[PDB]
Amino acid sequence: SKVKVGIIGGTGFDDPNLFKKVGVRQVTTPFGKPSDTLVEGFVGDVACVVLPRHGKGHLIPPSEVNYRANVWALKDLGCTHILATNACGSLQEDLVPGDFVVLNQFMDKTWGRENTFYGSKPDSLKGVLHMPMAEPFCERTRQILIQAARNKSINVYDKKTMDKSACIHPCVHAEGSAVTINGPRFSTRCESFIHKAMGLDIVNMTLVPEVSLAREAGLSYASIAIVTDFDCWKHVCVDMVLEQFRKSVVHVREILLEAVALIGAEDWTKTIEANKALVMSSRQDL
Amino acid sequence: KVKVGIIGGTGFDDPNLFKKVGVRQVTTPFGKPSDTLVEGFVGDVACVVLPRHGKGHLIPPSEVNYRANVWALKDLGCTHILATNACGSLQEDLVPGDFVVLNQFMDKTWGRENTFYGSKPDSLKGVLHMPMAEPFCERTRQILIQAARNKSINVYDKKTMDKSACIHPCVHAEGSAVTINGPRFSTRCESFIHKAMGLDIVNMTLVPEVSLAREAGLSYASIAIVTDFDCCVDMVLEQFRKSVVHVREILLEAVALIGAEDWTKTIEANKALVMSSRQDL
């Protein structure tokens, strides 16, 4: 019944100020060191832990982030949930810089990253885990993020029920799919055209394997993406984009803080049990 | 003189296809195979079995030593490899309980050792650019299909038969797999994309196994079992157990069919295709 919310801060959250620090935790996991020390505290009455994905100084690129250590360390400190941010590029006309997206789907183009806790090697947990991922996020937690935005007077656009003419910017998109590329380079026009033609909404570099390991760890995970603009190469463009992005960070902070409180206002007993049981029923070695 | 190797996937972690005559606990220049190799006979035809995932199924797809498994079978004199693969369906006419004798694939694996050749000190020297347009041994595919006919299993050929002749459960006479790295299953977004590309099924173990078999100069063919990973479970599991029994029958008949023919020319062509693919020569 104990609820505790971990937060993985991406670009723009390299040193977040979400709450007063009660504890600063330098932790080691069986999969190595996390990206930085973990800061533990309280939002209202809800215990919370925050970790910068890229470390202080933003020195670790997307492909070298130790996703296993970050997720394992949050589990180890008792987290039941993880809320994560990520900065992204738009692939579709209705997703414009300054919007947010509460993702529900992804296509994985990453490689070379440790993406599972289990295996046959000495540095892994014993066993073979095949997790279902058809809808890869925790749906309850997704809806918390969306309600938090409604609660903070931020426009919410749901393409599954609202006319396109009701898409008022800036807005939180209530659903969406990301293609996760490995980085560090951005896509060619050729690549972006194909990703767009496949119906993908945004592009990012950090969602996978973070979302996958959160599920393997029995935790409820949801991501909120900040749409920004990486195409100033076609002047003063960068300051306008960075001013919009600073505003985006303010609003996502309010969304995150309100989502933590909304998580604590509910019972999660059966959802946490289901999270843990799904890990156990996915063991193919038995 | 033929010798048939068998790589058993999920459902064949402990095959018992024949009375064990001998065991081979071996290693290779590319590391340890998945498990000890079990030697025997089907009729008069020599046969060797190894479970792809090891006994107890402790080895995930991306950590299987495909190089070592293929090399160990080659080292014992195998001329053929028959493999099983458990798969999910991407298309309406492939339903749980069916089988596919694959003839195509789309590779989305990474991080696996997938060639015996290169410039690293521990590789075989040379640059091997092997053709893979039709990646399986066609003679051996048709053996698997014929074996299913001889064991009273429906065969469906969508090139020549109307959809109304697709009577389940059936062996699909051709098909393409997307091979994903795993260990996780696909998102709905990924499945939708793979389906829209026209791929029939999804698997995690076919590649690089098929590629390395051709590098080794061996005739390779795969029979996939269609099951249902996203689902209830009691009916799926009992159905999968029935499919395992059917594949066992197909494999034992296939070994006998192989031994019944001469393979001298096909084997020599297997070996010459390796030679002619050496760009360093």
Added chain:
Amino acid sequence: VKVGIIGGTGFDDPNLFKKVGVRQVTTPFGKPSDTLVEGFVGDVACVVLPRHGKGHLIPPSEVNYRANVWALKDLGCTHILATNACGSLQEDLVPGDFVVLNQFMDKTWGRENTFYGSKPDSLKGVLHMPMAEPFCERTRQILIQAARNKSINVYDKKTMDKSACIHPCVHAEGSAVTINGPRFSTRCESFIHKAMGLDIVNMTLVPEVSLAREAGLSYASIAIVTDFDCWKSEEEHVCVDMVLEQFRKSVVHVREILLEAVALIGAEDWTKTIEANKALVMSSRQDL
């Protein structure tokens, strides 16, 4: 200016110019594929590096692209011209043609594809480089004009009728899918790449083109269309002989184009283009 040349299949033993000397270098990312041939084309300094090393013993996935590009950068190169042998995916690109690529779709993995990271084997930092149009456009148009000056047909599908495609020709644009190799594609894979609208398939363009931009160098590639499906003909020995002889004629044409391209580069001023190549690197630093 100073032009580096990375020669692929068909350029293992380069004899482009009156060779001055051969040079062995080291880089912070290891040794390059081979020693380098230093010389001159007119007044312009030129260096040549066989991508696969002499003997062609290094396969595409094991090429040390970082060391090759950084070696050329450390020798003062401002430009890199690369050749790449490729297969066609579309009806109008036939063996013997050439392609001055302007786009790619990347299917490589497991190669060192960036100079920057948090590991000791890399430069300190996080570099996020724009790649929307991944080649140097001025250098692309140099290769094309060099083909015109050498009386090689040039075909621009945006502006020319396909029946007005005279072979052998230089296609003025084109997209590559770069597969990791070493095996060739299945029919299923080729069909999907074709359906995506890709023009040719190769194994060596990426990360070479990405690292050249990371290094602040102007990079353009001329692909050589050849034929990899001799296994389909009833007379494969004769097929490979004919394909090999046509490929030999192609490398003669490409040598002409490369030599003319080097002189065309040295004839222009590149002060602002080079400056822009450098500032793009700097501004792509997300840690700074």
